[PDB]
Write a protein that binds this DNA or RNA. Sequence first.
DNA 1: GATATC
DNA 2: GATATC
Length: 8
Amino acid sequence: XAXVXAXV
DNA sequence: GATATC
DNA sequence: GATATC
Ligand SMILES: *C(=O)c1cnc2ccccc2n1
Ligand SMILES: *C(=O)c1cnc2ccccc2n1
């Protein structure tokens, strides 16, 4: 759920 | 480092 | 299960 390097 | 909503 | 980036 975090949106950092992936954004899910 | 830099992590939480589906 | 469902994950990558400066
Ligand atoms: C988002 O809350 C979150 C938490 N754990 C994960 C594990 C693997 C892929 C994506 C994820 N997203
Ligand atoms: C993004 O590429 C990425 C990869 N690994 C992580 C681990 C912990 C927090 C954030 C992250 N972001």
